[PDB]
Write a protein that binds this ligand. Structure first.
Ligand code: SF4
Ligand code: SF4
Ligand code: SF4
Ligand code: F3S
Lengths: 952, 103, 99
């Protein structure tokens, strides 16, 4: 009641760490794996605790950039639902008891040759684990490995075996690819080598005044994605007709294939693809998606070889996946051995087989046949609950290990903290099965990596983020024409198809407990906390019997606003439950309207419906894995939609999918941009004012900002792909709270940056998608500052917009005057207070907001203050009184996360800075300029490079 | 709106016109006070007009003066604080090339 | 209907018109604030406003506090100014004296 503040005790160390300065965060080089392939990350430890993850500039596949999963691994480690103890049968047990039971069980196996012993891991690329598994197989000859995961690359290795007769790894160097063609290949999505491909593609799309060339992207996909956004031409073909499309493409170029009866639009698309190809030989690449059948991969290799792209844009290396194999076939063989009762012991290392296996395999029922089941899941997953001897697994941020990225690099997974709840790694278990219990994970990876690179090599590897000796050698395989020519090449049919796609934020369902990813609005859909059956408007009209024409969305420029109003009226059918019958299964999942979807195709997103997940996501979405089948894991044949009425509430962060004829998004052509980079701005202003220049006049003086630092930001629309990595980075850096689905339904999501798609163009059933990131524009004449009565929002000496939490009384007037609506309010108590692990995840340099205050983008002021203090201290310690900040000294979290490099931050006044050079371009513009706000965050208009045969 | 505001079709004000009525009311009130002082001895005022009507008209002139100032300041502060570029050129020209001294 | 004289002299018509005017004034404040705030410059920042039960409860509650204070005023203090009324009576008597 008195004394203003309590006692606040302070507990220091008893022995100081040798290399740590208290109050100074440090950085460590580790590796994060997505689908078994590694990604070098630079992770920040504040006082021995991981808090932020950023890119490792020294590591390929992460040249200073990360994906949303690498950013969200921070909160995934701090989940309060992670496993803490060993469970024999749900009973808390010990590690020594499990070791004795494993040794006794393996003694019985020693009487045989391990015939009953079976393994079950995911896509393994770690050399240490692969060497220990091989040693265990030499000790037990009749044992089998059997690796499987729901998001695998079985079609890639199958196509490589069909074409070259051996296992090869295909790498794409997009930096020298003027024409790129994607056959249902979502290479701009989180996958193998996603950051490197997205960076090279973006740097080829960043056009300037002196620029002279620009690459072109062709994509053919069933459901639109991030790759289709950055495409100059997009063809919404069905998922089954893409194999026949590839055959027709190979046939048109004069190479062995098969002609196919296709639509006139697909015929004109084949024409243009073939014409732009053959004119860019060695400057082109054809990419086949992992979802497409093996024949599509083989035909793509053949097309690339004939065009001369091999050795220039397509490179072949030795396999980097340890054992490359058809994982679904090995899973069928394992469940067959389980049904026959041959297996006696089944050891699983992650992957959640009970939830991830296809529905027609009945993994849970056959799992009872094997008496001893053992699992390491890092959570109490569904499989561990139905298994004996559950062993908690150590998080990648608290364990020793290694991994291999695409093209092979063999980076080290360096821990940052002792395991919180204990928990062993995979190689520790493999050493336990090798008669070596109580083996330290440090000594295991250190013993394997020694005697190969040396002690000085291990020290250099820990210092940097890579190992310089390990890289996949370049090989030259031979192509088999007869095998790839004599292939059935399946044709579409059987009616409405189902396309199984990984969820953009949840992947295989591992991150269903992560609040940051579950709340992240999905790209192109903007849904949160839920799962839906995505279908085009025409498909929903025809199949669910909805009373709309779907032809009124077609029109010209004269009736564009009327078509947008009809699309608004049509969006009212979102939420209708549909009883999809695929192959003996009814799913009963609500529907959602995605305009770009191909007709007669429904996209179902994986990773929902879990029952033994954490408190977050414990019962979200409808499980699609039961209807998933082993014969076709990505495509479907025939389905029965069966509309049931019985609406379900779906929640979206935008609720309006069309810009109502305003100057929000600017698009141009490269041929006209070359002659004059300012032509887009000269347009609009003529149609709005009759002149080529808007003579905006203001009544306020503002401030000068001449000899001082002026912080500014530039967003390049030609590089944004909607990967939503900047949003998770902003959440992880600025302690942004996580509200429930109920609070998002009422429009109370808290996000300092948001990406908006606007589905614009003719037809509105085949629309171009425009993604645009929006944060605080930092208006020099900010209207949000002239309305807050307590002066809680003012302006900074450097032109920044100061939003002070402890002064806001919460009038909510600062938001109504914000033209861009980039201010979020704590209507209730949103920040977590009780959970200790979430309190450990908070960034100590940012205050955690309480109920009744406002938030908005602060240009990551903690990093600006740190660099300014460091610059002043370096200036006075040398006796200069200069105080000068380098260009790359400050990097906001959204700038570092972006794998494409679309966000550039720096000093406006320093003319040699990258931002000053970018803002001087002809296509640099600021949103809502008619309001004299003078924003410091500007946009670079999107420039397109379309073909003349398709446009004319 | 038609005679005066249409001179610059790029600008419009909703309070305008009501400002004209208060302006015309102040002008005709001062005109009435002048003409009353002129004809104060017409043998009709002398027998039927006292100081009460003169005091009431003086109070009306005072009330219409503060009313006109209130309308003009209201229009100014609305356009000034909300720095929208479609309404700023009006007060730009009236504050430029010496016109500020008139204001 | 207030333009006419018979309606202006009718008591029930005045009560109904006053009630309708009060409802229309609340609707006008709603149109000015909520409708204008729902759809702004950026179409992506568009949403709908649906009031809950608690702000309604505050509304009826404010009516009750208003009427509680009025009932206490009419119970303790005189609701018509007395000395002004007797002065008005004296003024009307003087006016009738001067015809
Ligand atoms: S700006 Fe954000 S959404 Fe766009 S590409 Fe960069 S990280 Fe992804
Ligand atoms: S974008 Fe909004 S919050 Fe940011 S400075 Fe401008 S008005 Fe203020
Ligand atoms: S600059 Fe910082 S606060 Fe602003 S959007 Fe980017 S990460 Fe968030
Ligand atoms: S009005 Fe001001 S008091 Fe807070 S809610 Fe906005 S900064």
């Amino acid at each position: 009641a008195c004394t203003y503040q309590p006692r606040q005790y302070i507990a220091p160390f008893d022995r100081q760490p040798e290399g740590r300065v208290p109050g100074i965060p440090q950085y460590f080089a580790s590796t994060l794996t997505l689908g078994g392939y590694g990604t070098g990350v630079l992770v920040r430890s504040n006082e021995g605790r991981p808090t932020k993850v950023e890119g490792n500039p020294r590591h390929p596949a992460s040249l200073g950039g990360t994906d949303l999963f690498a950013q969200a691994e921070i909160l995934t480690m701090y989940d309060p639902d992670r496993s803490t103890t060993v469970l024999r049968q749900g009973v808390p047990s010990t590690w020594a008891e499990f070791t004795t039971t494993l040794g006794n069980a393996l003694t019985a196996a020693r009487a045989t040759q391990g015939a009953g012993v079976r393994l079950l891991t995911t896509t393994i690329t770690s050399p240490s684990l692969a060497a220990q598994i091989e040693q265990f197989l030499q000790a037990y000859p009749q044992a089998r490995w059997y690796q499987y995961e729901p998001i695998n690359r079985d079609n890639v290795v199958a196509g490589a075996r069909l074409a070259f007769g051996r296992d090869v790894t295909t790498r794409y160097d997009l930096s020298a690819a003027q024409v790129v063609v994607s056959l249902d290949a979502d290479f701009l999505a989180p996958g193998p080598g996603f950051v490197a491909y997205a960076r090279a593609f973006a740097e080829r799309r960043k056009v300037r005044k002196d620029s002279t060339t620009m690459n072109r992207l062709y994509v053919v996909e069933a459901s639109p994605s991030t790759t289709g956004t950055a495409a100059d031409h997009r063809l919404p073909l069905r998922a089954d007709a893409i194999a026949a499309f590839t055959g027709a493409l190979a046939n048109e170029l004069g190479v062995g294939g098969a002609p196919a009866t296709l639509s006139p639009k697909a015929e004109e698309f084949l024409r243009a693809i073939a014409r732009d190809l053959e004119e860019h030989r060695g400057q082109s690449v054809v990419i086949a998606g992992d979802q497409q059948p093996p024949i599509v991969h083989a035909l793509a290799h053949l097309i690339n070889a004939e065009l001369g792209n091999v050795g220039q844009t397509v490179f072949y290396h030795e396999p980097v996946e340890a054992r490359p194999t058809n994982q679904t076939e090995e899973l069928v063989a394992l469940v067959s051995e389980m049904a026959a009762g041959r297996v006696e012991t089944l050891i699983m290392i992650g992957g959640n087989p009970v939830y991830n296996a296809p529905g027609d395999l009945r993994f849970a029922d056959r799992m009872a046949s094997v008496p001893l089941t053992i699992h390491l899941s890092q959570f109490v997953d569904e499989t561990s609950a139905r298994a004996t001897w559950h062993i908690p697994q150590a998080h990648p941020l608290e364990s020793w290990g290694d991994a291999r990225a695409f093209d092979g690099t063999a980076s080290i997974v360096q821990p940052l903290i002792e395991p919180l709840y204990g928990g062993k790694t995979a190689n520790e278990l493999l050493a336990a099965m090798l008669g070596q219990p109580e083996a330290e994970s440090y000594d295991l990876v250190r013993s394997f990596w020694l005697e190969q690179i040396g002690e000085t090599g291990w020290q250099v590897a820990l210092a940097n983020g890579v190992i310089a000796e390990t890289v996949a050698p370049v090989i030259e395989p031979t192509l088999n024409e007869g095998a790839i020519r004599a292939t059935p090449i399946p044709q579409p049919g059987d009616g409405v198809e189902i396309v199984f796609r990984p969820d953009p934020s949840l992947f295989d369902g591992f991150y269903a407990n992560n609040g940051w990813l579950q709340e992240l609005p999905r790209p192109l859909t903007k849904l949160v906390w839920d799962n839906a059956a995505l279908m085009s408007p025409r498909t929903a009209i025809k199949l669910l019997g909805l009373p709309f024409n779907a032809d009124r969305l077609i029109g010209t420029e004269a009736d564009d606003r009327e078509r947008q109003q009809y699309l608004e009226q049509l969006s009212k059918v979102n939420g209708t439950i549909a009883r999809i019958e695929y192959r003996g299964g009814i799913i009963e999942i609500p529907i959602w309207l995605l305009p770009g979807h191909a007709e007669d195709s429904i996209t179902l997103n994986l990773g929902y419906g879990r029952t033994h997940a954490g408190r977050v996501g414990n019962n979200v979405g409808i499980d699609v894995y039961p209807i998933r089948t082993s014969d076709s894991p990505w495509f479907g044949a025939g389905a029965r939609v069966t509309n049931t009425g019985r609406t379900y509430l779906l929640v979206s962060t935008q609720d309006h999918w069309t810009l109502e004829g305003r100057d929000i998004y600017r698009v141009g052509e490269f041929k006209k941009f070359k002659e004059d980079p300012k032509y887009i701005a000269k347009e609009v202003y003529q149609e709005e004012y009759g002149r080529e220049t808007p003579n905006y006049q203001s009544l306020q003086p503002g401030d000068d900002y001449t000899g001082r630092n002026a912080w500014g930001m530039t967003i390049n629309l030609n590089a944004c792909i909607g990967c939503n990595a900047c949003v998770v980075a902003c959440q992880a850096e600025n302690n942004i709270a996580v509200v429930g689905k109920d609070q998002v339904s009422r429009g109370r999501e808290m996000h300092w940056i948001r990406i908006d798609r606007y589905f614009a163009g003719e037809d509105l059933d085949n629309p171009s998608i425009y993604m645009m990131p929006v944060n605080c524009m930092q208006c020099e004449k900010a209207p949000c500052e002239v309305v807050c009565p307590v002066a809680a929002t003012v302006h900074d000496y450097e032109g920044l917009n100061n939003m002070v939490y402890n002064r806001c009384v919460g009038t909510k007037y600062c938001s109504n005057n914000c033209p861009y609506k980039v201010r979020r309010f704590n209507f209730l108590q949103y920040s977590d207070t009780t959970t200790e692990t979430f309190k450990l995840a908070f960034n100590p340099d940012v205050t955690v907001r309480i109920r009744g205050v406002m938030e908005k983008c602060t240009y990551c002021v903690q990093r600006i203050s740190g660099a300014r203090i460091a610059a002043k201290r370096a200036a006075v310690q040398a006796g200069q009184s200069s105080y000068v900040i380098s260009d790359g000294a400050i990097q906001t979290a959204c700038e570092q996360a972006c794998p494409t490099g679309a966000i550039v931050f720096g000093d406006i006044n320093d003319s040699n800075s990258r931002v000053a050079k970018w803002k001087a371009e002809g296509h640099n513009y600021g949103l809502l300029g008619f309001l004299n706000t003078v924003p410091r965050t500007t946009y670079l208009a999107r420039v397109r490079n379309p073909s003349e045969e398709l446009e004319k | 709106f038609d005679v005066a505001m249409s001179l610059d079709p790029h600008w419009f004000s909703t309070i305008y016109g009501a400002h004209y009525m208060a302006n015309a009311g102040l002008m005709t009130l001062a005109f009435l006070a002048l003409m009353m002082s002129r004809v104060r001895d017409a043998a009709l005022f002398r027998e039927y007009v006292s100081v009460k009507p003169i005091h009431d008209i003086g109070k009306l002139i005072f009330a219409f003066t503060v009313l006109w100032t209130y309308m003009s300041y209201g229009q100014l502060v609305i356009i000034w604080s909300g720095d929208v570029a479609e309404f700023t050129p009006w007060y730009v020209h009236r504050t430029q090339h010496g016109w500020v001294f008139v204001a | 209907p207030l333009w006419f004289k018979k309606v202006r002299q009718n008591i029930p018509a005045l009560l109904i018109i006053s009630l309708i005017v009060s409802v229309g004034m609340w609707l006008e404040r709603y149109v000015i604030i909520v409708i204008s705030l729902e759809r702004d410059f950026l179409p992506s920042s568009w949403d709908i406003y649906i009031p809950t039960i608690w702000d309604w409860s505050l509304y009826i509650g404010t009516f009750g506090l208003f009427f509680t204070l009025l009932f206490l005023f009419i119970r303790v203090l005189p609701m018509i100014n007395i000395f002004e009324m007797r002065l008005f009576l004296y003024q009307e008597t003087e006016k009738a004296k001067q015809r």
